[PDB]
Amino acid sequence: PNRAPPCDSSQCVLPDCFCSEDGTVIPGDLPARDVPQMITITFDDAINNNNIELYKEIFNGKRKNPNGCDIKATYFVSHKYTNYSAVQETHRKGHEIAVHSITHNDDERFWSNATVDDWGKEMAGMRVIIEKFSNITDNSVVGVRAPYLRVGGNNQFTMMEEQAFLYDSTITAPLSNPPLWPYTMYFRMPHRCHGNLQSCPTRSHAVWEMVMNELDRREDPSNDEYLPGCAMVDSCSNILTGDQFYNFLNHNFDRHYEQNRAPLGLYFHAAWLKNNPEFLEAFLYWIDEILQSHNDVYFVTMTQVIQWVQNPRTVTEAKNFEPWREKCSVEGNPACWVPHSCKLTSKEVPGETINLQTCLRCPVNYPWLNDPTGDGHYHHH
Ligand SMILES: *[C@@H]1O[C@H](CO)[C@@H](O[C@@H]2O[C@H](CO)[C@@H](O)[C@H](O)[C@H]2NC(C)=O)[C@H](O)[C@H]1NC(C)=O
Ligand SMILES: *[C@@H]1O[C@H](CO)[C@@H](O)[C@H](O)[C@H]1NC(C)=O
Ligand SMILES: [Zn+2]
């Protein structure tokens, strides 16, 4: 019908649009030698006591980018069991908070077939929950990642344009050399719709796609030959030791650093690092080794990648680039010293009692799809 046309370099102009024929071209045609290697560490799913101390151990206020600012990560947060005081504190420390739905609905077919309204309830609803119970008023919750990385055809992106989300990070790009840079959705995707029965958008949408390049899981990138890539780090099932993880990180860093310097995505679930102390040790060791030996590698949020694409800065220019210095090295105190611990209930989650921690007063019932504020109000007809 109204299929989005292939990239038209003349109609797609920075900073509101970026594309190339195959997605490998550097924004602003900076040469690769001069592009800061951006790394986006992300954490999925819910934030609470299962992982709050893990994040403190990683983001300890001593690991600094070459601009002297704390390294930054992005959290795609799902609602259930989340501690919204901790979300608020993570945001205060300068990490990005993005939405990963209210329900994390088990059924992969629901996401691939959901209506525009369904996507809004899950994603715009989750934004409402974060903005209220984490008291975030600056409109910085702008990203979306769908549970199980199930893309929602055009409906997901229609929803996101209507709801004024900045970017999506659900679409996977197959293992490619060179890997792909982010792209906007005004023009046709520069790669195949990848994954089992995925339903990808086909029309124009005013949405950034922080594409998820599959990583190369091969233990010997020369001799071994064909193995499918993996998007989530913890879904590379052959990574069993700290050493394998360490080499895996070096190999895929080199794939990006020695080619087009496309942002390197390291997407995790909090448990995979916590439940395997060998993986956490190799990860921290690798981060420290990369930070010490590189003055041209930046650990940044997803929003911060987009801000660079909108105004590309050389490695030399990067150290005074203002968007990358927002909340540089935050100390101060939490928004509240002892959060309320709300023991809450809802007809929408029948039977369960769920603790929601927040610096706000406890709401009347547990926030869910049909009542994201937890106010118990009767909606109008
Ligand atoms: C929820 O998260 C908050 C924020 O990290 C935790 O708050 C800490 O609570 C202790 C003891 O109540 C206080 O002494 C600290 O000042 C709080 N820290 C911050 C940064 O606010 C809280 O313990 C968490 N609760 C649960 C159940 O996960
Ligand atoms: C949100 O934070 C601001 C700034 O600290 C504070 O003035 C306000 O009371 C908070 N809002 C709520 C509802 O607690
Ligand atoms: Zn998830």
Residue 231: C-alpha distances to residues 7, 206, 228, 264 (Å): 25, 24, 10, 11
Dist. CA 206 → ligand 3 center (Å): 25
Tokens 């080794």 -> residue: 289
What is the greatest pairwise CA distance in the chain? Answer: 64
CA R_g for the chain = 20
Q: What is the DSSP string of 273-297?
A: HHT-HHHHHHHHHHHHHHHHH-SSE
Query: Cα angle at 191 between 190 and 195, to 5 degrees?
Result: 145
Ligand 2 mutation target, pool 135, 359, 360, 373, most atoms within 8 A of CB = 135
- Show binding-site residues for Zn(2+): 45, 100, 104
Which position has the token pair 């001799």?
Answer: 223
Report how far ligand 1's centroid is from the alpha carbon of 251 (Å).
38
- 317 contacts: CB under 8 Å, gap ≥ 6: none
What range defines the domain where residue 8 resides?
Answer: 1-381
Find out whether 207 and 157 touch, Cβ atoms under 8 Å.
yes
Task: State whether residue 119 is helix, strand or coil.
Answer: helix
**Measured distance CA(261)–CA(11) in Å, rounded:** 25
Cβ contacts of 225 within 8 Å, gap of 6 or more:
218
Distance 135 CA to ligand 2 centre (A): 6
DSSP state of 87: H
Task: Report the alpha-carbon distance of residue 356 to residue 354 in Å, rounded.
Answer: 6
Ligand 1 nearest-atom number relative to CA 336: 21
- List the binding residues: 45, 100, 104
Nearest to 23 by CA among 199, 259, 201, 248: 259
| 171 backbone dihedrals φ, ψ, rounded to 5° | -80, 130
**SS3 state at 353:** coil
Q: Which atom of ligand 1 is nearest to the CA of 89?
A: 20
DSSP element (H, E) containing 109: helix 108-113
Nearest to 101 by CA among 78, 119, 124, 81: 78
Where does 294-378 have alpha helices with state H? 302-310, 315-318
Atom of ligand 2 at shortest distance to CA of 359? 14
Q: Is 360 in the pocket of ligand 2 (CB under 6 A)?
A: yes
- The tally of domains found in the chain comes to 1
For 249, the 3-state DSSP assignment is helix
Distance CA 163, CA 155 (A): 12
Strands 183-184 and 208-209: antiparallel
Buried b (16+ CB within 10 A) or exposed e, 43-71: bbbbbbeebeeebeebbeeeeebbbebbb
Answer whether 208's CB lies under 8 Å from 166's CB: yes
The closest of 227, 198, 205, 204 to 214, measured between CA atoms, is 227
From the CB of 85, is ligand 1 less than 6 Å away?
yes
User: Nearest residue CA, atom 9 of ligand 2?
Assistant: 135
The residue whose CB lies within 8 Å of the most ligand 1 atoms, and thus the one to mutate among 338, 340, 358, is 338
- Cβ of residue 334 lying under 6 Å from some atom of ligand 1: yes
Name residue 184's beta-bridge partners.
208
Residues with Cβ within 8 Å of 173's Cβ and at least 6 positions away in sequence, in order, are 23, 179, 180, 191, 194, 211, 212, 213, 214
CA distance 15 to 35: 17
Nearest-CA residue for atom 14 of ligand 2: 360
CA distance linking residue 45 with residue 81, whole number of Å: 10
| Chain position carrying tokens 């970026």 | 18
Where is 357: in which H helix or E strand?
Answer: strand 354-358
The residues pairing with 61 across neighbouring beta strands, listed in sequence order, are none
For atom 3 of ligand 2, which residue has the closest CA? 135
- N- to C-terminal Cα distance for the chain? 34
What is d(CA 315, CA 264) in angstroms, rounded to the nearest whole number?
A: 16
